[PDB]
Design a protein around this ligand. Structure first.
Ligand code: HEM
Ligand code: HEM
Ligand SMILES: C[C@H](O)[C@H](O)[C@H]1CNc2nc(N)[nH]c(=O)c2N1
Ligand SMILES: C[C@H](O)[C@H](O)[C@H]1CNc2nc(N)[nH]c(=O)c2N1
Ligand SMILES: CONC(=N)NCCC[C@H](N)C(=O)O
Ligand SMILES: CONC(=N)NCCC[C@H](N)C(=O)O
Ligand SMILES: [Zn+2]
Lengths: 407, 411
């Protein structure tokens, strides 16, 4: 029940013990592996609070100290009295950093301890949420020198006073179904774009329209806000060798800022907790640009290169893919906007894994998400065995608010 | 119980019921997923249920379930097991068994082809020379002058575990690897240990970069013996590029016939420890893994140099650029020489059609995403976007330990 992981390129073996601390379930069983599946009260709360505070006090090397026993006693009194409890700033910061640390799908976790935590638990209105979010956007963007940050709105109470950001990311492009039957802009965002339009947003109906924020404070109906354009750093996409690439009219935004997940710390649930780092190049150039269900540009690019598109075995798709990804990196680099290539990021993740094995006894990692969507086996993560398991504090999926909201 | 899998590109949802017929364990639990781990004798008692389960599956597939012929066969195997402690498969059951081991192989992207498999029954084989002859016949048949035909040759099953038939090679055709005194490797680094064994057993190594290894063949638990495959039977393809004329001067070639020879075939509880099988290549096996893994031929640098790529920063994606050109060269070379090969786009697209068919007609298709997704260009192939369920069905191909680690030497 101590487990080994081997790297098949280097023969390095690591022993995992951290998995024994894992609490939540994976979706797998002895009979079936679900590794490739995308989405697999008072009495409940006190064990969860205890588990967390124990790890917190252990981390500041004060386990079993009076300050430990006193905080446990105090929270226990507070749950008994109010049915919830409030985290100290120090615990909140620890919790959020560790939720990133525990994120098994995240290749960038070498950065986990450098996270700016913005405490927005005093927020009461959607206007206040807009303010906090602009401040986060501007802080994280930092004129292109990106800095990781999370903004944490008030925790769930009875479940009818939820804070939610309706957007899937703070910054994303609109998608529109056309009379044609084709899609203009980002097909991933068609339904959300419709909810915005139906809410009064007037869309430019273009290929790259930054969506408005749709913010829900305290379980109320959500409200629209335009992020000031000067706060949205975008990069026009050009190629260092192909003069025609810029005519494709492509651009992307600099700040990736996931805003639809739920942060769980010590059993408390932070349903609105937008966080941001910076992009790995493949996210935009392979997935956002080349997925069939996304901007799906492989065909237009291949044509401009004059490749033989008659047969798959000419590898015309693969050739265009490499070029598109070269252009994304070149463009962010030329404009001084932080970006990481898939070679650099995966090399750092292997080094992080070794650190975590050494100092913590393991590192939960989901191979299916960690290996980049191009050139998998030429990155070292491909050859690295990983164990996937669930630790808390964590980031969790939650259902989309419109399926849940009672208007 | 019903399990759904979704394709995130097409929104197609499929429903799996076949997993209920799975008995063997995956390595995962409720608390841990071991989906990326490469590797996560038998009483007369345990043997009859395994035989029964298999014969029920066979008679079902032939629309003869519960027939007198089905009942008499169960009775006959039962009597044979308690009398002799094992049993012999009928030829038709052996064919059925081997095809199904392939159909059930969750790591295999080529399974659309599963019902087209030439089964060579070598269970009358007794000596290593006999094994050599069977294997030459398999190679010549499978090769078919470049028009590759899938095949398997099945040597006698395990009895007491002391008389095993084993092919010590990991594939029938592979290149020697040699560790040099300065610590560099000549040839294929994957085959260094095996190469050292062959040399010790008496092989005279030419010591070049692409020396076809001799066969090392163990019959009936005896010490293994060396044999040279006749060079006329080993089809190879020199690698060149359609636009880059310097590519040929890299001196690269590869063999046409991929023939895995170290796995164990389990049918109805019987263990076939020597069961070499062969199909044809998907391009990336050679052009991505065999050529570009750091632990294999490792040609990325030398190629990118010749392409004059910017090699001072990884973010130029020089490695990715060279990678694509190499893989073009491999497909171009095989196609030009009329040797069967499949590109990763074709193969994955075919797999998805296979998988959808299997859900509809079989109730499922166990698949290992980690292995199914190609090692380059993952997300522009449809399998990247397909959720899969991995579980183990019998008959099956299984790993077994390398024979030099377990063999009792007779001297
Ligand atoms: C600093 C730069 C960072 C890099 C380069 C990075 C890298 C990545 C990449 C490439 C993915 C996969 C995204 C996808 O395929 O959609 C990912 C997922 C994830 N990342 Fe990180 N990350 C970074 C910062 C962070 C921060 C600051 C947090 C939290 C505070 C975090 C938490 C996660 C989570 C929870 C997922 C899974 C999201 C999902 O399931 O959709 N990341 N990250
Ligand atoms: C017909 C042409 C075939 C193609 C294109 C094909 C394709 C592949 C590929 C690309 C892999 C992964 C190989 C690797 O990474 O090492 C594989 C694995 C496998 N294939 Fe197929 N295959 C074919 C025929 C067959 C046949 C005839 C059998 C058995 C009768 C078979 C059984 C398997 C098994 C058991 C594995 C897993 C091997 C392992 O775990 O090392 N394949 N196949
Ligand atoms: C079905 C499959 O799990 C799905 O396509 C996954 C595969 N790996 C991934 N990996 C990352 N980083 N992001 C993703 O969206 C996905 N999608
Ligand atoms: C550690 C990891 O499981 C290992 O490198 C796997 C990944 N996927 C693979 N997929 C295929 N087809 N072949 C392989 O050898 C591997 N290697
Ligand atoms: C730092 O934030 N994490 C990321 N690098 N990406 C988060 C998700 C972004 C998404 N894959 C996208 O391509 O927009
Ligand atoms: C037909 O056999 N199936 C294959 N396509 N490959 C089997 C294993 C071959 C191995 N990956 C190789 O590169 O030599
Ligand atoms: Zn699993």
């Amino acid at each position: 029940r101590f487990l080994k992981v081997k790297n098949w390129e280097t023969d390095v073996v690591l022993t995992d013990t951290l998995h024994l601390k894992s609490t939540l379930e994976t979706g797998c069983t002895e009979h079936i592996c679900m590794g490739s599946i995308m989405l697999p009260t008072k009495d409940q709360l006190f064990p969860l609070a205890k588990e967390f505070l124990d790890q917190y006090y252990s981390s500041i090397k004060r386990f079993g100290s009076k300050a430990h026993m006193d905080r446990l006693e105090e929270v226990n009194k507070e749950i008994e009295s109010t049915s919830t409890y409030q985290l100290k700033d120090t615990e909140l910061i620890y919790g959020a950093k560790h939720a990133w640390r525990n994120a098994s799908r995240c290749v960038g976790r070498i950065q986990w301890s450098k996270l700016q935590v913005f405490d927005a638990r005093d927020c009461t209105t959607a206007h206040g949420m807009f303010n906090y979010i602009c401040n986060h956007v501007k802080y994280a963007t930092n004129k292109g020198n990106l800095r990781s940050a999370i903004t944490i709105f008030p925790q769930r109470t009875d479940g009818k006073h939820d804070f939610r950001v309706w957007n899937s990311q703070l910054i994303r492009y609109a998608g529109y179904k056309q009379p044609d039957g084709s899609t203009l802009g980002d097909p991933a965002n068609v339904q959300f774009t419709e909810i915005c339009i139906q809410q009064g947003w007037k869309a430019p109906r273009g290929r790259f329209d930054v969506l408005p924020l749709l913010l829900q404070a305290n379980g109320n109906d959500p409200e629209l806000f335009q992020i000031p354009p000067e706060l949205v750093l975008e990069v026009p996409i050009r190629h260092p060798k192909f003069d025609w690439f810029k005519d494709l009219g492509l651009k992307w935004y600099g700040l990736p800022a996931v805003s639809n997940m739920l942060l769980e710390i010590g059993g408390l649930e932070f349903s609105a907790c937008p966080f941001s780092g910076w992009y790995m190049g493949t996210e935009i150039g392979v997935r956002d640009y080349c997925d069939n269900s996304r901007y799906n540009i492989l065909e237009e690019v291949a044509k401009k290169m004059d490749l033989d598109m008659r047969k798959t075995s000419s590898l015309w798709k693969d050739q265009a893919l490499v070029e598109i990804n070269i252009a994304v990196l070149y463009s962010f680099q030329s404009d001084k906007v932080t970006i990481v290539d898939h070679h650099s990021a995966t090399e750092s993740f292997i080094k992080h894994m070794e650190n975590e094995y050494r100092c913590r006894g393991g590192c939960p990692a989901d191979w299916v998400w960690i290996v980049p969507p191009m050139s998998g086996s030429i990155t070292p993560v491909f050859h690295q065995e990983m164990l996937n398991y669930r630790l808390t504090p964590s980031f969790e999926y939650q259902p989309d608010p419109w399926n849940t909201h009672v208007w």
